[PDB]
RNA sequence: GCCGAGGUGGUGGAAUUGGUAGACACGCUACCUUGAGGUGGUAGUUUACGGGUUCAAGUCCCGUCCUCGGUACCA
RNA sequence: GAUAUUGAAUGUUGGUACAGCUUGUACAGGAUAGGUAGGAGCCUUGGAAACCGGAGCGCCAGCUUCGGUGGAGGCAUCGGUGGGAUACUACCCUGGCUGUAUUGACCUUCUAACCCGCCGCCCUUAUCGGGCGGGGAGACAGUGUCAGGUGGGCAGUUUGACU
RNA sequence: CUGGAAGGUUAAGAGGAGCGCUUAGCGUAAGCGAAGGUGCGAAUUGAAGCCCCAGUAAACGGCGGCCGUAACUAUAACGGU
């Protein structure tokens, strides 16, 4: 194929990046732990970067080559990940800030330090 | 089909029976290994089904007659070179023909394996093929044997061979055979899950044994009341024996109970996990510098190994010797102690005791005893310095056995424990990993890193240097190359530098875009375009 | 339940079983109930599955 | 331990003979010179 | 008195003849850290006994002593 | 569980009975030589050198086939190598695809056997059963033989002597 | 008990490598011996169960020791194992 759809998912500890067909069909997939670090070294936006670059690596085989990147959870590598998409040799169009936000919804889980 | 069946075959010679109840198998091109502790007829077996032995007991049938016998050992094996698809062997390996007698010990086997192969074989039974061998050699083994005309047979203590290598295997125990075909990886899963249920049946008839030991010891200390305080008072005196006869029949009942279920049970203890305790002292207050060696050369005749190679080691680190096949590994060694053409200088303390492991075994003073044999001065110095060294170390009740008719998997171990008792302060170890067992040189390879430096450690082992290595000396051409890494690839100036600076300010970049992204607008966008052009730009040159 | 072609039924023989144990048993027919006409009419009786094997018309 | 041991001919290859010894201080195939009845005449015999 | 059970370092306690003043968790000692304690970090002390068997003994064996408990005189 | 009632299709992975043929280099070398025998010539207008495309292997050196542009050229002893010569014959089972016939196993699906303490009609004023017509299950189930496990639910029995 | 079941084992039925026995024949003897009949029979396949992995106690059942420590006269809130 040559157009898919870029699921980021940039969680407080994992920035899983999964490039997908346009009706959802994973063509390859990646993520912080996946590439190695193990610590708490998979929350630094380094390693979504990396993340980026082999899940564009993988994308490239049967292969796509326009993106469109769609940005989900409250994290911290959503920039370098959609910078290093472009950098590893595709192109990145539509930007989808879509973090999942419930109107009111279920309750949290409390606060920590009570 | 199968082609070669055992039956109850046996074995006994003069330390007990070796091998009893043996029942196995061998089929139409089943890659079938023998795995099993060094000295418990993992060879004798091979020399069983050769008819190089004669079994005591036990019935060994054969059909198809050819039996390319490869051992360990084979003593200024023959230069018949003969049927010449052996020499498409001794040519891949890369080893030259010319003589026997001066050929390194890594060439031997690889010539000797060689005239094995091609012969004419539907059925191999050699003892260790995985020994001196390099990966570019030991990879080549699986391919031969997985492009290969029938049934193999092999005795190889590596959890390494045998992933790859093997269909069925014949594991050596407690004098008895079993088999399990498929792996080795999942072979252990099936051997301490077949422990996990003998331990747990082992536990379970243990713990019944105490619980009606228990009631019937009860029982026995109301019936002695119950006899004792009868012809008091009230009944007579046998209302109240009666009740002691009733409390002693069920005291028989459940003994009764007890045997029988204990003879239908017969759930042995489970047999101990094998360890060596081993260890090491070496702590003798030692100097700083021990081996110098400038401008060394090596050749012979024509064949030149060492050119002006220059290194020195002092004491106090780990340094291994790797040689891919023949970088003189064990010439080296020779040459670090010797004279004859170490053409240039060797310096080396003269006060260091240099303790010394040879990759050939042709040093013993044979036919004598480990008693006049090994330096055991009053009492316990047999019993505390020597045999609970032996004994621990991997012997049995061998303490006299003539040393090369001893199991020559051993005599490494001889060799071993005469080094280790004495904290002789310097040792080299030209090649120890081969002829060694899982259990054992897995603790060699732990106490060696706390043993108190000054080590040469020659081994083709990948893994078992990873705990022996500090510095390395990567034998080559023309000379030695003393590494302290790695060392690939020549590490550079200008791409090197630029590259990790690069990256470096390109992360600084990333990080502070991705840290707040709506604020101190845009500098950032173009320090980041122009920064990440510019490590394409570095890299495209 | 005896078959109506031949005359084919439950018997009664032993369960011998390890020690030699008498124990008294039967014998059944695979007997297999089908639709034949043993008159001109077909009746729907009991056969056997000796007897039905390629020789009587189903 | 002690073991049975009987002592077949060379000459005839019958058994004739039984003795015993140890598997331990004597590990090795005894053989001894007896009468064989067959042979009529002393003869080297052969633990088997 | 009889039977059954255990007798290790200050403590509780594992150890199928193969190295233990102790191998394991606590105490204890010397130092460090702290204002001084505690925690924390570093190093340090012949198997109840006597006589064997053994190349080797806490273990295997023969005897003595102690303590738990059952089984008795008596109140 | 097998087997008998109990057969009709469509794929599957092994193996035969008839069949297709391809895969082959340690170095030296102009190269890819598996070896045993003949061997000084063969292939060409029913097409050679060369280019190109693709199925195919490859130890990526170079081979293998097929088709398409081309126009009379390839290729062999001998020359060299080295342990051994390149044009047919077979094999070697190292490493594939495709079809016919069965073979074993597995998945689906069908319906005519079997089953229906489902409906309607008739025998028939009958909650029996039994003929017909539908519907449902359907090679299962049930049932017979064979077998293993389970089985105090039941049965026959044993459970010593001196003192 | 209940659930899982990758894997080990595990029957009969299937399969039939092979080995006997007999025998025309070949062998001066010694012995070998095709085909057939027939006796036995290995590898392979072969479920449930069991081994294994989890849940279940208003299921069957089971529910500990010892040592120190407080103005002493004693116990231990406490600590160790
Ligand atoms: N020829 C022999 N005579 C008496 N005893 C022997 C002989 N060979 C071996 N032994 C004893 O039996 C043990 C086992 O020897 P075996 O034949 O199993 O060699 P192996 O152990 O198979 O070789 P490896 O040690 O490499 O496994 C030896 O270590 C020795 O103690
Ligand atoms: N004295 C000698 N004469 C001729 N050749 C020699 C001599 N010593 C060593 N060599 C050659 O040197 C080569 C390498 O031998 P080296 O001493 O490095 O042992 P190696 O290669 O490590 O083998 P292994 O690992 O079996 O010891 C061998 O091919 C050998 O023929």
């Known amino acids: 194929i040559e157009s898919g759809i870029a699921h980021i998912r940039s969680t407080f500890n994992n920035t899983i990046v999964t490039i997908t067909d346009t009706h959802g ?68 169009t539509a930007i989808r800030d879509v973090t999942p936000v419930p109107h009111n919804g279920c309750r949290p889980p409390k606060r920590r330090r009570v | 089909k199968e ?7 046996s074995y006994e010679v003069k330390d007990q029976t070796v091998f009893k109840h043996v029942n196995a198998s061998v089929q139409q091109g089943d890659i079938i290994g023998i795995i099993g502790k060094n000295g418990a007829g993992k060879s004798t077996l091979l020399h069983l089904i050769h008819n190089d032995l004669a079994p005591a007991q036990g019935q060994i049938l054969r059909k198809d007659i050819k039996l390319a016998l490869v051992e360990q050992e ?61 990966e570019k050699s030991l990879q080549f083994l699986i391919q031969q044997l997985k492009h290969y005309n029938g049934t193999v047979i092999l005795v190889s203590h590596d959890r390494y061979f045998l992933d790859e290598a093997a269909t069925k295997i014949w594991s050596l125990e407690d004098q008895t055979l079993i088999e399990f075909k498929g792996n080795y ?33 009860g029982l026995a ?21 009666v009740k002691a006869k009733r409390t002693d029949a069920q005291i028989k009942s459940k003994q009764k109970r007890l045997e029988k279920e204990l003879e239908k049970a017969k759930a042995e203890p489970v047999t101990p996990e094998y360890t060596v305790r081993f260890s090491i002292d070496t702590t003798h207050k030692t100097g700083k510098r021990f081996l110098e060696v400038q401008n060394v050369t090596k050749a012979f005749g024509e064949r030149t190994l060492f050119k002006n190679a220059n290194f020195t080691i002092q004491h106090g680190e780990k340094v291994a010797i790797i040689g891919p096949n023949g970088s003189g590994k064990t010439t080296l060694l020779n040459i670090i102690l010797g004279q004859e053409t170490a053409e240039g200088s060797v310096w080396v303390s003269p006060s260091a005791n240099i303790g010394y492991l040879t990759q050939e075994v042709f040093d013993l003073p044979l036919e004598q005893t480990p008693e006049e044999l090994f330096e055991n001065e009053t009492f316990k110095a047999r ?77 083709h082992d990948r893994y078992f240097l990873e705990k022996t290595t500090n510095s390395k000396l990567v034998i080559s051409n023309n000379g030695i190359e003393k590494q302290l890494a790695a060392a690939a690839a020549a590490a ?36 980041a375009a122009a920064a990440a052009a510019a490590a394409a730009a570095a890299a495209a040159a | 339940r005896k078959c109506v072609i031949t005359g084919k039924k439950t018997t009664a023989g032993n369960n011998r079983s390890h020690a030699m144990n008498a124990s008294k048993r039967t014998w059944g027919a695979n007997l297999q109930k089908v639709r034949i006409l043993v008159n001109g009419k077909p009746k729907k009786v009991y056969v056997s599955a000796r007897a039905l094997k390629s020789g009587k018309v189903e | 331990m002690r073991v049975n041991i009987t002592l077949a001919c060379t000459e005839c290859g019958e058994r004739n003979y039984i003795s015993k010894k140890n598997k331990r201080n004597n590990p090795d195939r005894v053989e001894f010179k007896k009468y064989c009845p067959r042979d009529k005449k002393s003869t080297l015999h052969r633990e088997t």
Do not use: C
Request: charged share 25%; no cysteine.
């Open chain 1, 25 to 92: 069909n994973a063509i390859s997939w990646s993520s912080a732990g996946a590439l190695g670090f193990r610590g708490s070294r998979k929350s630094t936006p380094f390693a979504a970067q990396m993340a980026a670059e082999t899940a564009a690596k993988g994308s490239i085989e049967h292969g796509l080559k326009t993106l469109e990147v769609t940005v989900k959870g409250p994290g911290s590598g959503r920039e370098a990940a959609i910078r290093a998409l472009q950098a590893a040799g595709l192109e990145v």
């Open chain 2, 3 to 9: 082609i070669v069946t055992l039956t109850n075959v």
């Open chain 2, 74 to 134: 084979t003593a200024a094996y023959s230069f018949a070179d003969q049927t010449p698809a052996e020499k498409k062997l001794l040519e891949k390996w890369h080893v030259p023909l010319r003589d026997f007698h001066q050929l390194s010990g890594g060439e031997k086997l690889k010539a000797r394996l060689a005239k094995g192969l091609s012969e004419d074989a539907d059925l191999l039974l050699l003892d260790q093929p995985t020994n001196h061998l390099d």
């Open chain 2, 185 to 217: 990886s999942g072979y252990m899963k099936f051997r301490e899950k077949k422990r996990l249920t003998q331990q747990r049946e082992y536990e379970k008839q243990q713990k019944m044994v105490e619980r009606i030991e228990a009631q019937m010891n």
């Open chain 2, 221 to 241: 200390s109301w019936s002695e009341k119950a006899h004792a305080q009868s012809t008091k008072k009230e009944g007579f005196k046998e209302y109240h024996r």
């Open chain 2, 383 to 459: 019993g505390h310095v020597q045999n609970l060294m032996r004994h621990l170390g991997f012997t049995a009740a061998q303490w006299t056995e003539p040393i090369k008719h001893m199991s020559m998997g051993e005599r490494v171990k001889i060799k071993l424990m005469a080094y280790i008792l004495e904290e002789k302060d310097v040792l080299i170890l030209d090649q120890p990993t081969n002829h060694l067992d899982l259990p054992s040189r897995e603790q060699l390879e732990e106490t060696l890193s706390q043993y108190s430096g000054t080590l040469l450690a020659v081994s």
């Open chain 2, 492 to 527: 550079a100036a200008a791409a090197a530098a630029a590259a990790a600076a690069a990256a470096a300010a390109a992360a600084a970049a990333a990080a502070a875009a991705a840290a707040a992204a709506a604020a101190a607008a845009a500098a950032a966008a173009a320090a």
